[PDB]
Amino acid sequence: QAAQSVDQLIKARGKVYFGVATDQNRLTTGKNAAIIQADFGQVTPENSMKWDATEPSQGNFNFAGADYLVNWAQQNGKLIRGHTLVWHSQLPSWVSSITDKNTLTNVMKNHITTLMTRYKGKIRAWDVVNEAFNEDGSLRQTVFLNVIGEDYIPIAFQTARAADPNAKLYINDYNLDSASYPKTQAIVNRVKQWRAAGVPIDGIGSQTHLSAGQGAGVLQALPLLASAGTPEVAITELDVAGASPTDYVNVVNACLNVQSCVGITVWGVADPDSWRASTTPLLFDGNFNPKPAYNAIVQDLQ
Ligand SMILES: O[C@@H]1[C@@H](O)[C@H](O[C@@H]2CO[C@@H](O)[C@H](O)[C@H]2O)OC[C@H]1O
Ligand SMILES: O[C@@H]1[C@@H](O)[C@H](O[C@@H]2CO[C@@H](O)[C@H](O)[C@H]2O)OC[C@H]1O
Ligand SMILES: O[C@@H]1[C@@H](O)[C@H](O)OC[C@H]1O
Ligand SMILES: O[C@@H]1[C@@H](O)[C@H](O)OC[C@H]1O
Numbered sequence: 678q679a680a681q682s683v684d685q686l687i688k689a690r691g692k693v694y695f696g697v698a699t700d701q702n703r704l705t706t707g708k709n710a711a712i713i714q715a716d717f718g719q720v721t722p723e724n725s726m727k728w729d730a731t732e733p734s735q736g737n738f739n740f741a742g743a744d745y746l747v748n749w750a751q752q753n754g755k756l757i758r759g760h761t762l763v764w765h766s767q768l769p770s771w772v773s774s775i776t777d778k779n780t781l782t783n784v785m786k787n788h789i790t791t792l793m794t795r796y797k798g799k800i801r802a803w804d805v806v807n808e809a810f811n812e813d814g815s816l817r818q819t820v821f822l823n824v825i826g827e828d829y830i831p832i833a834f835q836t837a838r839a840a841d842p843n844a845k846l847y848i849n850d851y852n853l854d855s856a857s858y859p860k861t862q863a864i865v866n867r868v869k870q871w872r873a874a875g876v877p878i879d880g881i882g883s884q885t886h887l888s889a890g891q892g893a894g895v896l897q898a899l900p901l902l903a904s905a906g907t908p909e910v911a912i913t914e915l916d917v918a919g920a921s922p923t924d925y926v927n928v929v930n931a932c933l934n935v936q937s938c939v940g941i942t943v944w945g946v947a948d949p950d951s952w953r954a955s956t957t958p959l960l961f962d963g964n965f966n967p968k969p970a971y972n973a974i975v976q977d978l979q
Contacts, residue, residue, distance in 0.1 A: 678708065678711045678712050678714070678715040678716060679712070679715065679716050679967045679971060679975075681716075681975045681979075682715060682716045682717075682718075683695045683716060683717070683971070683974050683975055683978060684696070684716060684717045684718035684719070685718075686975060686978035686979055687929075687940065687941070687978055688718070689978070690933060690978055692932070692933070692938070692939060692940050693719075693756070693939040693940045694717075694718040694719040694756050694939070694940035694941075695717060695718060695719070695940055695941050695942075695943075696717050696718060696719025696720055696721065696755070696756065696758070696940065696941070696942045696943070697713060697717050697719075697720060697721070697942060697943050697944075697945060697946055698720070698721045698722075698723040698914065698942065698943070698944045698945050699713060699720050699721075699722075699723060699746070699945070699946065700722055700723045700724055700725050700742060700745075700746060701725065701742050701745040701746060701749075703723070703945075703946070703950060704745075704746075704749055707946075707947060707950075707965060708947075708965040709946050709947070709950075709965075710749075712946055712961065712965065713753075713755065713946065714753055717755070718754075718755055718756060719755055719756035719757065719758065719801070719940065719942060720746065720750050720755050720756075720757060720758075721757070721758040721760050721913070721914075721942050722742070722743060722746045722759070722760055723760075723944075723945070724742070724767075725741075725742030725743045725745070725746055726743045726746075726759055726760055726761070726792065727760075727761060727764065727767045728762075728764065728767060728768050728769060728772065728788065729767040729768065729769055730742060730743070730767075731743060731788075731792060732769065732788055732791075733769055734769070734771065735771055735784065736787070738791060740795060743792075743796075747796055747799060747800075751799065756801045757796075757799065757800050757801055758800070758801060758802050758803070758804065758913070758942065759792070759793070759796070759800045759802070759803035759804065759844070760803075760804045760807075760849075761803075761804040761805075761806075761807040761849060762788065762789050762792065762793075762803060762804070762805050762806070762807075762833065762837065763785060763788075763789070763805060763806045763807065763809075763821060763829070763833050764806075764807040764808060765808065765817065765819035765820065765821070766807075766808070768820070772784065772820065773820045775820070775824065776824060777824070778824055778825055778826075781820070781821070781824045781825055782825055782829075782832065785821065785825075785829065785832070785833065785836075786832070786833075786836045789805070789833060789836045789837050789840060790836060790839075790840045793837060793840035793841045793844070794840050794841065796841075797840070797841045797843070798841065798843050800841065800843075800844050801844065801845065802844055802845040802846070802847055802879070802880065802909075802911075803837060803841075803844050803845075803846055803847065804847050804848075804849040804882055804913065805833050805834055805837045805846050805847060805848065806830055806833055806834070806848050806849070807849045807850070808849070808850055808851065809822075809830060809848065809850065810850055810860055810863060810864055810867075811860075812852065812859065812860050813859050813860070813863075814859045814860055814862065814863025814864075814866075815863075816830075830848070830871070830876070831871060831874070831876045834846055834848075834871075834876050834877050834878055835876065835877065837877075838877040845879040845880055845908070845909055846877055846878060846879045846880070847878070847879065847880040847881065847882040847909075847911070847913075848864070848868065848878055848880075848881060848882065849881075849882035849883075849884065849913055850864060850881075850882070850883070850884060851883075851884035851885070851886050851914070852884075853881075853883045853884070853885075853898060853902060854883070854885060854887060854891055854894050854895050854898050855891075855894040855897070855898050856894070856897040856898045856900075856901040858898075861898055861901060861902065862901070864881065864902070864905070865881075865901060865902060865904060865905040868881060868905040868906075868907060869905050869906060872905075872906060872907070878907055879907060879908045879909055880907050880908060880909035880910055880911060880939075881902050881903075881905060881907050881909075881910045881911075882910075882911050882913040883895075883898070883899065883902060883910065883911065883912055883913060884913055884914040884915075885912045885913070885914065885915045885916075885928060886914060886915075886916060886944070886953070887915075887916070887917045887918065887924060887928070888917075888918045888919075889917070889918055889919040889921055889924065890921075890923075890924065891917075891924065892917065892921075892923060892924030892925065892926070892927030892928050893924075893927050895912075895927060895928050895931040896927060896930065896931045896934070898931070899912075899931040899932065899934070899935045899938060900931075900934065900935055903935045903936075903937045903938070907937070908937065909937050909938075909939050910935065910937050910938055910939075911932075911938060911939055911940060911941070911942070912928060912931075912932055912938070912940075912941040912942065913942050914942065914944040915928060915941055915942065915943045915944060916943060916944040916945065916951060916953055916958035916959060917958050917970075918953065918956035918958050919956060919957070919958070920948075920957055920958050920959060920960070920968055920970045921970065922969050922970045922972075922973030922974075924970075925960075925970040925973060925974055926973050926974060926977045928941070929941065929974050929977060929978065930977065943959065943960055944958075944959075945959050946959065946960075946961050946965075947959060947961045947962065947963060947965055948961065948962050948963055949963045960974070
């Protein structure tokens with residue numbers, strides 16, 4: 678645990694939170710629980726709420742890991758971001774084997790409804806749809822798009838809002854780090870069109886999985902993302918190859934510059950536990966000590 682809390686400091690700047698991804702296996706080992714307790718104010722289940730973990734068989738739900746995280750979060754007063762409802766990855770084979778429009782639609786709705794009602798009122802935001810865009814801005818051809826068509830997105834969001842009107846509904850994606858990139862512009866145009874049609878998209882989530890030097894691009898990309906008109910936008914799965922303080926400060930400043938940016942979520946605590954460990958992209962090293970990037974963010978926020 679570090680002496681200065683980036684979450685407390687970001688709160689003093691007028692933002693809602695600075696959080697991290699985690700799960701039961703992380704919370705019960707290392708110094709993870711201590712660091713999240715003292716330095717962060719929000720958590721996102723890294724894997725316990727995905728489709729493969731929660732509904733391995735149709736109608737046969739498993740909330741073990743998910744229940745653990747929510748309970749731990751409430752007890753410690755940490756905000757929660759549900760992650761993630763509709764995604765083509767980590768999807769049970771029984772889902773992708775469905776070729777009937779009606780069936781897949783009801784199945785997708787049942788999945789969304791069940792997960793969201795179980796935690797009704799306890800989740801700040803949900804990543805309803807994850808990675809729905811191709812790099813060129815076109816909609817990714819997944820089983821949902823193929824079987825249901827474009828309407829699967831409006832349906833998912835409409836169903837989510839019905840399940841828990843208290844949560845902020847987000848569409849989440851990566852590679853939205855440059856204002857000139859086609860994907861970035863496309864999501865802004867698509868969200869604008871959807872909202873104009875009454876689809877309840879409260880926020881755009883920007884994963885922000887960066888490589889060295891890409892932090893500078895976010896200074897322009899976030900404001901562009903914000904121009905879609907959504908109530909909120911957020912940095913949802915931040916990590917930077919090399920963990921340079923320059924890149925990290927740039928992403929934080931980008932959020933401080935955009936009024937609709939509610940907060941930032943870093944994808945993990947310690948480097949070795951990162952899904953990109955080989956690039957030591959996190960704010961804490963293997964010894965669970967804060968890295969220069971952590972101290973630079975703190976100095977920047979104070
Ligand atoms: O639309 C709302 C924004 O007006 C709000 O903006 C915050 C206001 O306080 C400032 O200190 C913060 O920097 C800024 O983000 O954010 C929430 C949103 O709902
Ligand atoms: O522990 C790993 C997770 O960190 C990883 O999380 C995904 C990373 O890519 C993002 O686009 C997704 O939103 C996020 O869920 O998933 C694999 C797991 O092994
Ligand atoms: O069961 C939990 C699992 O769902 C999560 O993905 O990782 C931690 C485990 O304890
Ligand atoms: O698998 C995806 C990966 O390609 C991207 O870089 O980050 C998000 C992940 O979901």
